[PDB]
Design an enzyme around this catalytic site. Structure first.
Site, PDB file in Angstrom:
ATOM      1  N   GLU A   1      14.101  -6.070   0.099  1.00  0.00           N
ATOM      2  CA  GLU A   1      14.145  -7.449  -0.361  1.00  0.00           C
ATOM      3  C   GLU A   1      12.876  -7.860  -1.114  1.00  0.00           C
ATOM      4  OE1 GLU A   1      15.474 -10.144   2.814  1.00  0.00           O
ATOM      5  OE2 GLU A   1      15.074 -11.786   1.395  1.00  0.00           O
TER       6      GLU A   1
ATOM      7  N   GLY B   1     -13.284   7.270  -3.140  1.00  0.00           N
ATOM      8  CA  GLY B   1     -12.734   8.557  -3.525  1.00  0.00           C
ATOM      9  C   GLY B   1     -11.541   8.973  -2.673  1.00  0.00           C
ATOM     10  N   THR B   2     -11.529   8.592  -1.397  1.00  0.00           N
ATOM     11  CA  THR B   2     -10.400   8.946  -0.545  1.00  0.00           C
ATOM     12  C   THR B   2      -9.261   7.954  -0.721  1.00  0.00           C
ATOM     13  OG1 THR B   2     -11.817   9.972   1.126  1.00  0.00           O
ATOM     14  CG2 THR B   2      -9.562   9.291   1.836  1.00  0.00           C
TER      15      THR B   2
HETATM   16  N1  LIG Z   1     -12.072  -5.721   2.044  1.00  0.00           N
HETATM   17  C1  LIG Z   1     -12.705  -4.561   2.404  1.00  0.00           C
HETATM   18  N2  LIG Z   1     -13.128  -3.744   1.466  1.00  0.00           N
HETATM   19  C2  LIG Z   1     -13.743  -2.601   1.795  1.00  0.00           C
HETATM   20  C3  LIG Z   1     -13.938  -2.274   3.147  1.00  0.00           C
HETATM   21  N3  LIG Z   1     -14.594  -1.087   3.162  1.00  0.00           N
HETATM   22  C4  LIG Z   1     -14.790  -0.664   1.943  1.00  0.00           C
HETATM   23  N4  LIG Z   1     -14.281  -1.573   1.064  1.00  0.00           N
HETATM   24  C5  LIG Z   1     -14.298  -1.461  -0.390  1.00  0.00           C
HETATM   25  O1  LIG Z   1     -13.559  -0.266  -0.748  1.00  0.00           O
HETATM   26  C6  LIG Z   1     -14.259   0.415  -1.805  1.00  0.00           C
HETATM   27  C7  LIG Z   1     -14.849   1.709  -1.246  1.00  0.00           C
HETATM   28  O2  LIG Z   1     -13.701   2.462  -0.873  1.00  0.00           O
HETATM   29  P1  LIG Z   1     -13.501   3.040   0.621  1.00  0.00           P
HETATM   30  O3  LIG Z   1     -12.076   3.143   0.991  1.00  0.00           O
HETATM   31  O4  LIG Z   1     -14.353   2.235   1.711  1.00  0.00           O
HETATM   32  O5  LIG Z   1     -14.073   4.509   0.488  1.00  0.00           O
HETATM   33  P2  LIG Z   1     -13.552   5.941   0.947  1.00  0.00           P
HETATM   34  O6  LIG Z   1     -12.614   6.494  -0.037  1.00  0.00           O
HETATM   35  O7  LIG Z   1     -12.940   5.809   2.416  1.00  0.00           O
HETATM   36  O8  LIG Z   1     -14.892   6.812   0.986  1.00  0.00           O
HETATM   37  P3  LIG Z   1     -15.311   8.084   0.127  1.00  0.00           P
HETATM   38  O9  LIG Z   1     -14.284   9.273   0.513  1.00  0.00           O
HETATM   39  O10 LIG Z   1     -16.794   8.465   0.574  1.00  0.00           O
HETATM   40  O11 LIG Z   1     -15.323   7.788  -1.322  1.00  0.00           O
HETATM   41  C8  LIG Z   1     -15.393  -0.511  -2.269  1.00  0.00           C
HETATM   42  O12 LIG Z   1     -14.890  -1.408  -3.252  1.00  0.00           O
HETATM   43  C9  LIG Z   1     -15.723  -1.257  -0.958  1.00  0.00           C
HETATM   44  O13 LIG Z   1     -16.312  -2.526  -1.206  1.00  0.00           O
HETATM   45  C10 LIG Z   1     -13.474  -3.167   4.152  1.00  0.00           C
HETATM   46  O14 LIG Z   1     -13.591  -2.962   5.366  1.00  0.00           O
HETATM   47  N5  LIG Z   1     -12.876  -4.303   3.738  1.00  0.00           N
END
Ligand SMILES: Nc1nc2c(ncn2[C@@H]2O[C@H](COP(=O)(O)OP(=O)(O)OP(=O)(O)O)[C@@H](O)[C@H]2O)c(=O)[nH]1
Ligand SMILES: Nc1nc2c(ncn2[C@@H]2O[C@H](COP(=O)(O)OP(=O)(O)OP(=O)(O)O)[C@@H](O)[C@H]2O)c(=O)[nH]1
Ligand SMILES: Nc1nc2c(ncn2[C@@H]2O[C@H](COP(=O)(O)OP(=O)(O)OP(=O)(O)O)[C@@H](O)[C@H]2O)c(=O)[nH]1
Ligand SMILES: COc1ccc2c(c1)NC(=O)CN2c1nc(N2CCOCC2)nc2c1CCC2
Ligand SMILES: COc1ccc2c(c1)NC(=O)CN2c1nc(N2CCOCC2)nc2c1CCC2
Ligand SMILES: Nc1nc2c(ncn2[C@@H]2O[C@H](COP(=O)(O)OP(=O)(O)O)[C@@H](O)[C@H]2O)c(=O)[nH]1
Ligand SMILES: [Mg+2]
Lengths: 124, 423, 425, 426, 431
Positions: free
Chosen positions: C246, C136-137
């Site tokens: 580029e 969501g963020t």
């Molecule tokens: N490759 C990778 N993917 C991640 C990681 N952490 C979360 N994800 C993926 O990112 C998605 C979740 O989004 P996030 O950015 O972690 O969530 P957020 O927006 O910070 O959290 P909310 O505000 O609670 O929704 C899912 O598809 C997770 O599998 C990470 O450290 N590495």
């Protein structure tokens, strides 16, 4: 066809062309607008929250109406028990005094008859 | 979003509430004096979700104990962990509710409810970031049912942006305490439809059947039933209480489990069932009606969404393998218009006395069976107006009764509507 | 100078940023305390009066436990508190909460921190934005931030590193919604977006690294290597992709079609030396792409090979000649069939103690193929299944989003699909 | 807190009061002067500063002789004098005299004394009113009392313990008149009436207790146990407790249908241990019913089981589960569950020198069954036999009543009989 | 309900009344000087019902002695217990009424009755809780019947809410030759129907028949008849005078015994029947005593109870005996004789047991019955009245004092009405 592009201290670059293109050429929000859209969503949030609170306040008043209605039922029970009890007790009092008075009126009529019997005797 | 404020109301609410605090105090290493004496720091990283930290190295449950009758709360004060609760968090009236929803919800509950809200409001203000509220109660009695829902309503009005979560125990003729349970439950279900965000349906019908049929307990008592409830409540709160790659909280649970606001009644499940075990068999209990704490057969409907929590030391690869294999063999019992609707967590800390466990939180359209069973009992009493005068005498209109059952039969139809929906 | 500012939004963007900045420090000789015993690394690092080198970076995450990974991590002395922006409640997996509710509350603070970094640059190139599609963020706030950066930095380039959702590691059922919503809103505001498919990364870790159940750390370490290959010529005095502009020149002939496919090789387990021809062949194997899609179902618009380490031009041209002979690589009509090649002599670097082995030569191919539209089609389909029943829509509307934004976002993705098709025939 | 005020009217009401209040003192360790060497006995006893515990009770009778025995007997210091209220003339077995002629002269004094007892309660649950149907005072003065309690206390709970008449021990011919008259006038004022049949208690005392010719003292001490079982939930802190409002809610499906049937077990000769199961099965045997009627002829609408002594909840559950399987125990269509269970852990107490044996456990069942209608039919039929000739009606009319009250009472009883028929239909 | 005020009027009244006081005084331990010399507190628990407590720990009968003839009370003072009565309670005139009802009721009796009321008021006002009045008198003479019924109605006027009770001796040609007695009895019965609540019918015909036929007395005297009267009076008042399980009083008797106001003439019965001052060699058994309830030979009114039906019955058993056995015999006489009890008054027989037997007997039984057979007594009186009235025999004795014929016709109609309504209820069905 190899065409070199650039050389630098940490790398070099060139372009390898394997066939030229068949076709020559390539075929063919402001700050206020953003802020007004964010503020619009905020008002929709607040309108929804206000609609939720108004429904809850409507239930607060129903609860007050329920509690009052029970108090009115109690008071009307009291009021009708009291008027019926007084009605019963007054009708019984009247009835009983009326029976007693009739019983004394009959004995007193015997008493008048006795004086008429005593009069009849001296008359003869 | 860290702190949960927990409330337990009425006799049932306080009995299972007490057993809950017993079970998770053991898991988090808290003795009845509030002292930590545990072995690991995983037990303390999220302990503030449920416990306030006192001065003298102490942890006090963020719990408020409510009843219209003092008897049951004096019994918990004398129970094992009775001294862990804050003394000023007991809020008890004197006259009781008379097994009557209208008394708990209107006249008697209204007289005590502002004393409860002052304790709620004091616990809320000492929270860094209030996640929401967790209420335990029965629906069949008078206090938990009627006053619990009045409490929910007033808390919603004062904290309208916080999650409201209940563990709500459904009555069953099989282990009843009052003849008007069908009225009390139907009037409460109507309130929960409107005012809670997540409700775990704890069905005494199913608790009894688990004890009698799988546990061979020919005469189950509340102790036997509450051992299943406490095992379930520890399981569903696992991800709230222990650190894991899922930063689970009450709003994220609602967002991912509730596709439509009214449909927020979850079927809990637990394996293994125990009285007072391999990975593949654990995953299959998800469709085992014998393991559901709501007296519904999951194969009678379709899962909208499912959360599963596995506890104990076990292969996270073997778990994800068998979860996907259960989902595929049983594809006809999941709706196809919510892709990827099962999410799994594994936590290495097993519950007390078990080496491996599984707990399921299912949002199944088969939960309509629980509500249909209450509706039929309600209708059989209400068509003869049996015992109605004890509710009208509290000022209720008959129309409140018909409106609450109409709403419950509507919930039933809505669950049916999505059970038949195709992609 | 050609400064770039990195912005990390949400847990995925923050945790991948951690992995990238650790790798940059290892590549440039920056100790965890900030000290350091070619000056191109100043594009990514500023310098304080104590002689400390500081990432030109901002981290935005409304859950303080994640940002605490930065301020208490091994490299915590690199960062100043004004670079770490946190809050109380996260977006709860809800693009609308991240974009509208949270974003209206924090956007000005976030642009203020970015403005402080930009005031220290003499020739700001633009921004590298790391974020998830599914959070969501990562979805909701990032898209608000990109709109505002387009306003406040009109001529600056903006590149994204986007984490495309995989159900294996995902935690949210509504990630297809958040992905379409944020792609719609961000599309006209990004210049070049490298998508990283969590499932592709997951499979490369299982197959090439012999990890049974990859962690986020596994995924992030491999992702850091790709990012590093892509930025290597910004942070060293390279010859290809020497400024952000580029990237659009070499890879984006059409602004809407700005989603290049990255392919990386070699990925070798530390538990266990390949030639220029082998690693060049690996660039044309779909098992090594960062997004799952079949290039046989598409046509290339552009294609760059980025070599690192011990690579000689004679060996490259030899490898390419062998490929054109045995394979048919179909470019569109209007583009020349060929490659831009760069070599960066800086050797590939791995984290000590990690699961990636150190190799002598590596390569990253960045290609703009119409095949990457398959990834959008998978996302669009899950979106359609849920949206036809309006499942979960009320959580988005409850945050002040209008239902019709679902429809608009979905139409834009249909238009994007039709663009990819029309370019590809 | 949670106080209950007890009112004992007329000879039967007063003498049963003696047995109950004596039993309460023994159960709580209160000596006959109010002193005693679990706090909930306070619901029935106020306390003076001297540590004297005083029943929250009024004894009323229109003549003084029965209450004079209380005033001069063993417990003469237990009550304050102002609680023991007597006139001079009794009602001469005539409802009309108890309710109007004689009763009107003392009713205000009684209400003043009750008002003073109420002023001492911080959470008054309600009133328990003890009386006979057949006496002139028990019938006529109780009707007046109930009506006045409704005025003063509104819908505050009022429950009765009522002695249903038995020819064997009765000493009045007009008892069927007094019975119907007080039942008609009291019906809308009482929340729940526990009827006791003197004949049933008489028969139990012969059969189970080996007493050739039971005296009122035999009957009253048995009645005391039933009363004690019912109020034990209010006077002790037990596992499962039942307060006044819970009695009403669970036993009374309609306002007029408020006459539960009591059954007590075990009744064992002192000169002669039963399990939870056995004593539970005994409550459904027609011989142990405190009113002569046949529940197999009717349908149960509510069962309330009140256990005391050495009784664990598991055994009650197993006992009640057996009950639910007996086809000869039939519940109405509209009652999905009819069982309410109380368990108090203090064993039953018996008066030394009495005929009842000490037992380690006991149960009292209150059941609301359509079969109670048989006892109403027996009464109504005796009323009709006399009333068809207007035998004795002149004695009531002479005291101011009208004949209209007799037929209005009798047609209310016919409606009552027909209500019992209607609630039993499927 | 405590005190009763006793009144005795005329010769018969004062003679049976004096015997009553001798008999119960001995039962309560009171000697002719008013002192208590008894050995049981039970004799004193209810002594106030009939006696006032005086100065020297004495007991004085609450008794008013009345006669127009002055000699009769000199006979009372001469009697065994004559010294026990309050001297001021004797009220005496100078000429008897010559067996003339009109003299007693309208003329000479009326001039003495205010003096009687003087004494009545002072005994009544001194009562803490006055039950009412019992009058002993005969119906065939002039004073007891005429002045006695005048007294009743005058007392009723001042005490309308108290119970009015009589022991009324019915005339018989077998015992008195006075020809106008059916007139006096019929005029008196008219008064009693209207102004008393309870009347015990003591029939000189039945007393003579018991004395002649059962006691084998060839020429019974009033002393022989009054022995049966005093035994009956003691028996019926047993439950007023002793502590019993039922707190019997005059009002509770009327309420339970009298289903219709006019039908208040009780048939008393007694067993065993004995001659005066005669040793009793063997007592009687309980089932023996119980059987005499339907024995016409044991009835103090010359009626066969099997000729009608009992509306209500009260039976008192005296002596030491099983109350279980008493209850079983009383149930069985009812079961087997069910056809002599109206079905439409359920439970119309009530029994008491007092452990103190009357002097001279170890066990005894007294019955108080409201039987429709009492109509044979009023029919007998009514036939004798008519045989004279059709001839207007002796009517100038009564018109000479101011009466009219119509008052005779009215009293005869009222009594024949009484007969019809006994018959109505004897024939009434429950169906
Ligand atoms: N490759 C990778 N993917 C991640 C990681 N952490 C979360 N994800 C993926 O990112 C998605 C979740 O989004 P996030 O950015 O972690 O969530 P957020 O927006 O910070 O959290 P909310 O505000 O609670 O929704 C899912 O598809 C997770 O599998 C990470 O450290 N590495
Ligand atoms: N169980 C029991 N029944 C009694 C007792 N006393 C009287 N009864 C019954 O009560 C009915 C008689 O009514 P009472 O209570 O004695 O009369 P009362 O209320 O005092 O009225 P009055 O004396 O007529 O003014 C009969 O059915 C008796 O059998 C008693 O002590 N115990
Ligand atoms: N059993 C009984 N009957 C008596 C006695 N004395 C008189 N009688 C009857 O009473 C009736 C006559 O009435 P009395 O009592 O002698 O007359 P009175 O009341 O004195 O009136 P007077 O005419 O003034 O003498 C007759 O029927 C007599 O048989 C008596 O001592 N015992
Ligand atoms: C259908 O898809 C989903 C279902 C459920 C969830 C998520 C997605 N994602 C999330 O972050 C939250 N969440 C879960 N929450 C919780 N609890 C948080 C609320 O209190 C009770 C415990 N426990 C579990 C999960 C998943 C595994 C166990
Ligand atoms: C048929 O039903 C009844 C009949 C009679 C009574 C009663 C009911 N009940 C009662 O209280 C009164 N009572 C009786 N009164 C009296 N006397 C009181 C008046 O003076 C004479 C003695 N003697 C007796 C009884 C019954 C046993 C002998
Ligand atoms: N599972 C369980 N159910 C209970 C317990 N106690 C009561 N109940 C159920 O709760 C309902 C009665 O509600 P209760 O809590 O006793 O009433 P309240 O105190 O007025 O809220 C019935 O359905 C009982 O079976 C308990 O300890 N465990
Ligand atoms: Mg009495």
């Amino acid at each position: 066809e190899v065409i070199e592009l650039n050389k630098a201290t940490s790398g070099q670059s060139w372009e390898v062309i394997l066939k030229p293109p068949s076709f020559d050429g390539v075929p063919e929000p402001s700050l206020e607008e953003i802020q007004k859209k964010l503020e619009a969503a905020e008002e929709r949030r607040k309108y929804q929250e206000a609609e939720l609170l108004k429904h809850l306040a409507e239930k607060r008043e129903h609860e007050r109406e329920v509690i009052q209605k029970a108090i009115e039922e109690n008071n009307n029970f009291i009021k009708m028990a009291k008027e019926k009890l007084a009605q019963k007790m007054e009708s019984n009092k009247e009835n009983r005094e009326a029976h007693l008075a009739a019983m004394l009126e009959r004995l007193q009529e015997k008493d008048k008859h006795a004086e008429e019997v005593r009069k009849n005797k001296e008359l003869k | 979003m860290r702190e949960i404020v927990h409330i337990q109301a009425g006799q049932c609410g306080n009995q299972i509430g007490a057993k809950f605090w017993e079970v998770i105090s053991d898991e988090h290493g808290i003795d009845p004096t509030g002292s930590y004496h545990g072995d690991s720091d995983l037990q303390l990283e999220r302990i503030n979700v449920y416990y306030n930290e006192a001065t003298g190295n102490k942890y006090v449950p963020r719990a408020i104990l409510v009843d219209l009758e003092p008897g049951t709360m004096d019994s918990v004060r004398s129970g094992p962990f009775g001294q862990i609760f804050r003394p000023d968090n007991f809020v008890f009236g004197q006259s009781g509710a008379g097994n009557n929803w209208a008394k708990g919800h209107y006249t008697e509950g209204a007289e005590l409810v502002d004393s409860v809200l002052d304790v709620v409001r004091k616990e809320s203000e000492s929270c860094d970031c209030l996640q929401g509220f967790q209420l335990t109660h029965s629906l069949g009695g008078g206090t938990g049912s009627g006053m619990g829902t009045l409490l929910i309503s007033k808390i919603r009005e004062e904290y309208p942006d916080r999650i409201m979560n209940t563990f709500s125990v459904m009555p069953s003729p099989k282990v009843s305490d009052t003849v008007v349970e069908p009225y009390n439950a139907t009037l409460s279900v109507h309130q929960l439809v409107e005012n809670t965000d997540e409700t775990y349906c704890i069905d005494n019908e199913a608790l009894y059947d688990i004890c009698f049929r799988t546990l061979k307990l020919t005469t189950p008592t509340y102790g036997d039933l509450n051992h299943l409830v406490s095992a379930t409540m520890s399981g569903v709160t696992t991800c709230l209480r222990f650190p894991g790659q899922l930063n689970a909280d009450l709003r994220k649970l609602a967002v991912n489990m509730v596709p439509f606001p009214r449909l927020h009644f979850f079927m809990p499940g637990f394996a293994p069932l125990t009285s007072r075990l391999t990975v593949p068999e654990l995953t299959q209990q998800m469709f085992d009606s014998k393991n559901m704490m709501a007296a519904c057969d999951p194969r009678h409907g379709r899962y909208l969404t499912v959360a599963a929590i596995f506890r104990g030391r076990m292969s996270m690869k073997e778990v994800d393998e068998q979860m996907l294999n259960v989902q595929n063999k049983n594809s006809s019992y999941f709706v196809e218009w919510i892709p990827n609707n099962v999410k799994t967590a594994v936590c290495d800390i097993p519950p007390r006395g078990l080496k491996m466990s599984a707990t399921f939180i299912g949002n199944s359209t088969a939960i309509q069976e629980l509500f249909k069973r209450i509706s039929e009992q309600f209708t059989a009493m209400f068509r003869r107006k049996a015992f109605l005068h004890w509710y009208t005498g509290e000022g209720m209109d008959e129309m409140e009764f018909t409106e609450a059952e109409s709403n419950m039969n509507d919930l039933v139809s809505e669950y049916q509507q999505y059970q038949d929906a195709t992609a | 100078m050609r400064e770039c500012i990195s912005i990390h939004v949400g847990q995925a963007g923050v945790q991948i940023g951690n992995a990238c900045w650790e790798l940059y420090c290892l590549e440039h000789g920056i100790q965890p305390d900030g000290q350091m015993p070619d000056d191109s690394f100043n594009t990514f690092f500023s310098e304080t009066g104590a002689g400390k080198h500081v990432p030109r970076a901002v981290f935005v995450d409304l859950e303080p436990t994640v940002i605490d990974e930065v301020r208490t991590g091994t490299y915590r002395q690199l960062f100043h508190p004004e670079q770490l922006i946190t809050g109380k409640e996260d977006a709860a997996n809800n693009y609308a909460r991240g974009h509208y509710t949270i974003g209206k509350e924090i956007i000005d603070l976030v642009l203020d921190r970015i403005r402080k970094l930009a005031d220290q640059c003499t020739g700001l190139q633009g921004f590298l934005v790391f974020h998830s599609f599914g959070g969501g963020t990562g979805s909701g706030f990032t898209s608000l931030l990109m709109e505002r950066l387009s306003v406040d930095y009109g001529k600056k380039s903006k590149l994204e590193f986007s984490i495309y959702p995989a159900p294996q590691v995902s935690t949210a059922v509504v990630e297809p919604y958040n992905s379409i919503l944020t792609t719609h809103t961000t599309l006209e505001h990004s210049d070049c977006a490298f998508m990283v498919d969590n499932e592709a990364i997951y499979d490369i870790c299982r197959r090439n690294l012999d990890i049974e159940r990859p962690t986020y750390t596994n995924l992030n370490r491999l992702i850091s290597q790709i990012v590093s290959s892509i930025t290597a010529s910004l942070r060293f005095d390279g010859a290809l992709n020497v400024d952000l502009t580029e990237f659009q020149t070499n890879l984006v002939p059409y602004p809407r079609i700005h989603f290049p496919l990255a392919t990386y090789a070699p990925v070798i387990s530390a538990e266990k030396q390949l030639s220029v021809a082998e690693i060049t062949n690996a660039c044309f194997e779909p098992a090594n792409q960062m997004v799952k899609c079949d290039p046989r179902h598409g046509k290339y618009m552009a294609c760059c090979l980025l070599y690192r380490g011990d690579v000689v031009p004679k060996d490259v041209n030899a490898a390419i000649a062998t490929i054109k002979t045995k394979r048919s690589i179909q470019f569109v009509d209007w583009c020349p069939t060929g490659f831009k090649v760069g070599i960066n002599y800086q050797p590939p670097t791995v984290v000590p103690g990690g699961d990636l082995a150190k190799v002598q030569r590596a390569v990253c191919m960045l290609s703009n193929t119409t095949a990457i539209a398959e990834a959008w089609a998978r996302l669009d389909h899950k979106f359609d299944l849920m949206y036809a029943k309006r499942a979960f829509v009320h959580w988005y509307v409850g945050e002040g989003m209008e239902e019709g934004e679902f429809s608009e976002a979905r139409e834009d993705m249909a238009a994007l699909e039709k663009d990819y098709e029309e370019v590809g025939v």
